[PDB]
Amino acid sequence: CAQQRTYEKFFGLLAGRFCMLKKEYMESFEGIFKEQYDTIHRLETNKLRNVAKMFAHLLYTDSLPWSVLECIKLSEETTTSSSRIFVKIFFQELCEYMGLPKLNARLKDETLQPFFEGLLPRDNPRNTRFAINFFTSIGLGGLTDELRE
Amino acid sequence: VQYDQRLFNQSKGMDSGFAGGEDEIYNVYDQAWR
Amino acid sequence: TAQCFLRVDDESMQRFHNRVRQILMASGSTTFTKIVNKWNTALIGLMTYFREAVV
Amino acid sequence: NPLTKVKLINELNEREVQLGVADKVSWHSEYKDSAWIFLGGLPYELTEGDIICVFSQYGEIVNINLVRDKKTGKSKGFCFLCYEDQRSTILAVDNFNGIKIKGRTIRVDHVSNYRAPKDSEE
Amino acid sequence: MKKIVLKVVKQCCGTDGVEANYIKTEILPPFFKHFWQHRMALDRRNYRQLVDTTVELANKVGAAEIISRIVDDLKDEAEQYRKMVMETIEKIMGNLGAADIDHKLEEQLIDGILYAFQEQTTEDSVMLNG
Amino acid sequence: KEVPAKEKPSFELSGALLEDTNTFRGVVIKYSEPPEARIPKKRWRLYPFKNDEVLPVMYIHRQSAYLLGRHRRIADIPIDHPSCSKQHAVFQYRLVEYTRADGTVGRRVKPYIIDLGSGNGTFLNNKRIEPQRYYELKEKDVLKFGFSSREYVLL
Amino acid sequence: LKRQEAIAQNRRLTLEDLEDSWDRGIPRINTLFQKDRHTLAYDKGWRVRTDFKQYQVLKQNPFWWTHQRHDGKLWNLNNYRTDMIQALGGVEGILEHTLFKGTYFPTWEGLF
Amino acid sequence: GLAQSRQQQQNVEDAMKEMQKPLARYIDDEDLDRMLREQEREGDPMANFIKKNKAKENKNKKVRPRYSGPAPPPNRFWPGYRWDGVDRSNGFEQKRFARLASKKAVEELAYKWSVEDM
Amino acid sequence: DTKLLILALERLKEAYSVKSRLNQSQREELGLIEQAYDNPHEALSRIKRHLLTQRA
Amino acid sequence: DDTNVYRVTIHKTFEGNLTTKPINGAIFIFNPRTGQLFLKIIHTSVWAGQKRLGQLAKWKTAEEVAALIRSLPVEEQPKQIIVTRKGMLDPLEVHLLDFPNIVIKGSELQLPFQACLKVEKFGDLILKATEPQMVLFNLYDDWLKTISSYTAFSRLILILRALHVNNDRAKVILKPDKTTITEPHHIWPTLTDEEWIKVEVQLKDLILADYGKKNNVNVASLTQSEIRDIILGMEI
């Protein structure tokens, strides 16, 4: 999938068909994600897009646990470039599938959500401010809060 | 706007490449093999 | 908001069947690589306009 | 005779682009290890700064040499320019030839040996 | 001035005056150093004058003394320079002969003219007659 | 010891090299248009007033730049003013990026005026202007040709 | 966006039309950068004349909806041939065809 | 003046690639996963979060300052352009650039013309 | 003016790729096309000569 | 190739004296049709107890070679074996009595498999072994999908001879850029065909320059048959 010119939705369908068929495929496959983002600096500007939309498509059509995002580390100190525009086109491209509201909720509403460092970094007023700034730049701003008291 | 001259003139034409309706003259596979 | 389901009209597949019927007729007046190239031109002329509709 | 060498060096590059000569044998592998270029036909109103400004487009001249006369003169018309890289001299002899600055046209050639006070042809 | 002295070397060495060791000691080494270049094979009035002087230089000095100095130039990446060397070889060997060339030189010239025949671009026939 | 040598080099600009690039038919013109110089997209006209009443009308929507001077030989807009230099002040339109109150960003046509460093200087709003900077012209502002008061108003 | 960036800045589009791989977009961006822009921009009114050319010269066109010098090559099938080779092996015909009495051909890549 | 500096740079890169590095480099290599995290990778909203504006420091090969940012014409050999190089030439770069682009076009059409009746 | 006539002539020339062609009509068609190639203005004013006064 | 069965490393002990260590060795068997490299380990423990260690390896090798012939199937055993310089025609003749139809020949095509000990994936495998593992590797990585075995051999022996005459510049030539990554299941880098033949041209220029530096011979003064004789390793 990573290498076909423009992305073909056919892969997040075969992929999903496995990824919920046998128990194993979902586990192995997710391993491929966590493995995947934490490098993602090799392939860039194309394969990065095809693979990003590849995962967004799985999440949107589910057949993949909503917590794969525990690996995504939102920092702006520790995020690096191609990582950053991996996750960009990732959400921005997941945006319209779920629409903003149905994403905004399902991102948060799930209660048990605090597995990640993506959004919830309510930590020091740095990577907190950096989240807000990022998601405003990526042009979603569908979640922005005031932790500045 | 200052376009580069390397992008210019890379393909000529005013034909089609899908020449008329003559379906015998191998329109596919634009570049070579070896 | 909605979904769009697609199929091929019967006149298009009838036109392609009569198309390959006349390439079968023209098989007797040309060679083998010519009619295979003609099959290929007809198959691109179908498929590149019927991309998601062929499935 | 004073400016037909402009036409000669132009016809050399036209014959190179006509015959399809690759860059390995296109007249610049014979003049290697030398960043010195000779100028011809310069007007007498040119200072060293204007020559630097008109030939620093492809790289700054490291070593300038105008032919300033001893006592009674100011200039003759020749110049030596030593750039950084030899490809700058390639681009200067291929691009700055045939242009004109205030009347008289100028010419660019290579030196390749050493600077001389007067050996060339006025 | 290169063209003028290239014409001067032809007519100033043909009658009785200059001898062999005089020329092959101090006339021809700067001649092969500074004039056998790529820019002189481009202009046709300089292309013809070089070989037209080199013919009389081979008449005065000899065959293998010039050829063995330009026999390694048949494996160049330039077509017109190899064509100049090929015209030099054809005119010297058609005017003088081939008795002066020994066993230590003929495989070099044969391999050079075969390599020039393998990698020619234009439809000229000067290499054929050579 | 009196001089090092009587000759010496120059390293100064001759008129000729600057002149060949910028031609009024009999002389060089200072002021090459800045890269964002473009045609004015608003309706604009410069009206001269001798004393507050209409003299000609100059339509400014045609060109990116306009020159002020003493005669229609050199400058686009000339004045019968003996104490105006041949090149006096230049009217220049440009595209600049802008931000509105809402935070919306984009490209705006702005006209500017810059003194040429003319012999008698220039004034805007009946206030002296400094030379060598583009001043932002605003609607109805008065241009005048010499450091005190003059026989013509430009609006 | 990159055109307005190059207008706002003062750079040149050297190779920044390569992130879109020189052959993307439904008009196929390399149609703009060609030899005949100023002439083929005056060929307006197309895609309908070719459909009326079924009422002309007898070769029936299966490409009435496109021709490459205005909307571009909308498909690049190049790797299907290579994957056909890798699916049938690189020796897909050499074991079958007598290459050996063709000549002494040891390479089979310079074959023409 | 700078070709010998380029030779010194390529020889010190030659020495660091020979005397310490193996024959083949892998994916990890302890250098390439650093360069991949140090790529430009356009499409990054975090660029304006850490950078104020594209200013002009002393960005030059030497200590001396560099020419400002208008657009100079390309010349096939990426130069050290400085001290007022304003686009004066005879038109030899653009002509042979059009020549090589036309050559790359006519080889594409010549392959088509050769592959017609095969 | 020439920029449309060359488009029309190449639009006519595209329909002639095979050379197992007919005896007189389309060979003099391509002959008139190449005569319009060698002289654009002659065919350009010949179109105007057909275009003012000829309607039968 | 059985030259590197015995090889001695260079070391310095706690004392100032210099001695030799009979460390482990290699046996190279190469198939030029497919690219299979049969690499046999010779452990250090057989280098103790036996006498004339510099003369008994020629008799210890052929038994393991015959065991390899007996282990492999019928269609994969060779009809001809081209050995290195002659010391093994009669040992292979007396050890191949169970397979009489195998021809043993010593030709003029010597090949630098000792330069195969200069690459790192072979080097850490030959230095760290506690068993005669008999590994089976591949040198024609992904070339058979695009080129033949002929161009593969004509590339491989040139790169190996360039690594033999000068490991330094033949090592830096094989990585021409900083984007010349190598997958773990292969040993050669992955790069396009134009820079394949570019690396071939500059490595044959390396070999000709090493010849002209060693024997003080003008490179352009050699005929291309003589350039062929240098580039294959003919005894000149």
Curated annotation (Swiss-Prot), chain A:
Every MI domain range: 1-74
Coiled-coil intervals: none
Subcellular location: Nucleus; Nucleus speckle
Quaternary structure note: Component of the pre-catalytic spliceosome B and the catalytic spliceosome C complexes. Component of the minor spliceosome, which splices U12-type introns. Interacts with EIF4A3 and PRPF19 in an RNA-independent manner. Direct interaction with EIF4A3 is mediated by the MIF4G domain. Full interaction with EIF4A3 occurs only when EIF4A3 is not part of the EJC and prevents EIF4A3 binding to RNA.
Similarity-based family: Belongs to the CWC22 family.
Physiological role: Required for pre-mRNA splicing as component of the spliceosome. As a component of the minor spliceosome, involved in the splicing of U12-type introns in pre-mRNAs. Promotes exon-junction complex (EJC) assembly. Hinders EIF4A3 from non-specifically binding RNA and escorts it to the splicing machinery to promote EJC assembly on mature mRNAs. Through its role in EJC assembly, required for nonsense-mediated mRNA decay.
Name by which UniProt lists this protein: Pre-mRNA-splicing factor CWC22 homolog
Organism classification: Eukaryota, Metazoa, Chordata, Craniata, Vertebrata
Complete-protein stretch covered: 497 to 645 of 908
Curated annotation (Swiss-Prot), chain E:
Compartment(s) where it occurs, according to its Swiss-Prot or TrEMBL record: Nucleus; Nucleus speckle
PTM characteristics: Phosphorylated. Phosphorylation occurs concomitantly with the splicing catalytic steps.
Domain of life: Eukaryota
Residue windows of the HEAT repeats: 60-98
Family to which this protein belongs: Belongs to the SF3B1 family.
Role: Component of the 17S U2 SnRNP complex of the spliceosome, a large ribonucleoprotein complex that removes introns from transcribed pre-mRNAs. The 17S U2 SnRNP complex (1) directly participates in early spliceosome assembly and (2) mediates recognition of the intron branch site during pre-mRNA splicing by promoting the selection of the pre-mRNA branch-site adenosine, the nucleophile for the first step of splicing.
Subunit record text: Component of the 17S U2 SnRNP complex, a ribonucleoprotein complex that contains small nuclear RNA (snRNA) U2 and a number of specific proteins. Part of the SF3B subcomplex of the 17S U2 SnRNP complex. SF3B associates with the splicing subcomplex SF3A and a 12S RNA unit to form the U2 small nuclear ribonucleoproteins complex (U2 snRNP). Within the SF3B complex, interacts directly (via HEAT domain) with SF3B3, SF3B5, SF3B6 and (via HEAT domain) with PHF5A. The SF3B subcomplex interacts with U2AF2. Identified in the spliceosome C complex.
Name of this protein: Splicing factor 3B subunit 1
Source species of the chain: Homo sapiens (Human)
Parent-protein start and end of this portion: 784 to 913 of 1304
Curated annotation (Swiss-Prot), chain F:
Cross-link (Glycyl lysine isopeptide (Lys-Gly) (interchain with G-Cter in SUMO2)): 8
Compartments reported by the entry: Nucleus
One annotated Gene Ontology cellular component of this protein: nucleus
Biased composition regions of type Basic and acidic residues, renumbered to the chain: 1-10
Keywords annotated in UniProt: Coiled coil, Disease variant, Epilepsy, Isopeptide bond, mRNA processing, mRNA splicing, Nucleus, Phosphoprotein, RNA-mediated gene silencing, Spliceosome, Ubl conjugation
Post-translational modification: Degraded by the proteasome upon binding to the SMAD1/OAZ1/PSMB4 complex.
Binding partners and assembly: Component of activated spliceosome complexes. Component of the minor spliceosome, which splices U12-type introns. Binds SMAD4 and CREBBP/EP300. Binds the SMAD1/OAZ1/PSMB4 complex. Interacts with DROSHA and SMARCA4. Component of the SNARP complex which consists at least of SNIP1, SNW1, THRAP3, BCLAF1 and PNN.
Disease linkage: Neurodevelopmental disorder with hypotonia, craniofacial abnormalities, and seizures: An autosomal recessive disease characterized by severe psychomotor retardation, intractable seizures, dysmorphic features, and a lumpy skull surface. Patients are hypotonic and have poor feeding in the neonatal period.
Protein name: Smad nuclear-interacting protein 1
Source species taxonomy: Eukaryota, Metazoa, Chordata, Craniata, Vertebrata
Range covered out of full length: 216 to 370 of 396
Curated annotation (Swiss-Prot), chain J:
Tissue: Widely expressed.
Source organism, top-level taxon: Eukaryota
Region of interest called RNase H homology domain, as start-end residue ranges on this chain: 1-236
UniProt subcellular location: Nucleus; Nucleus speckle
Record field: transmembrane: none
Ranges for region Involved in interaction with pre-mRNA 5' splice site: 1-236
Mutation effect (residue 8 to D): Strongly reduced interaction with RNA
Note on domains (UniProt): The MPN (JAB/Mov34) domain mediates interaction with TSSC4 and SNRNP200. Has structural similarity with deubiquitinating enzymes, but lacks the residues that would bind the catalytic metal ion. Contains a region with structural similarity to reverse transcriptase, presenting the classical thumb, fingers and palm architecture, but lacks enzyme activity, since the essential metal-binding residues are not conserved.
Associated pathology: Retinitis pigmentosa 13: A retinal dystrophy belonging to the group of pigmentary retinopathies. Retinitis pigmentosa is characterized by retinal pigment deposits visible on fundus examination and primary loss of rod photoreceptor cells followed by secondary loss of cone photoreceptors. Patients typically have night vision blindness and loss of midperipheral visual field. As their condition progresses, they lose their far peripheral visual field and eventually central vision as well.
Protein name: Pre-mRNA-processing-splicing factor 8
The organism of origin for this protein: Homo sapiens
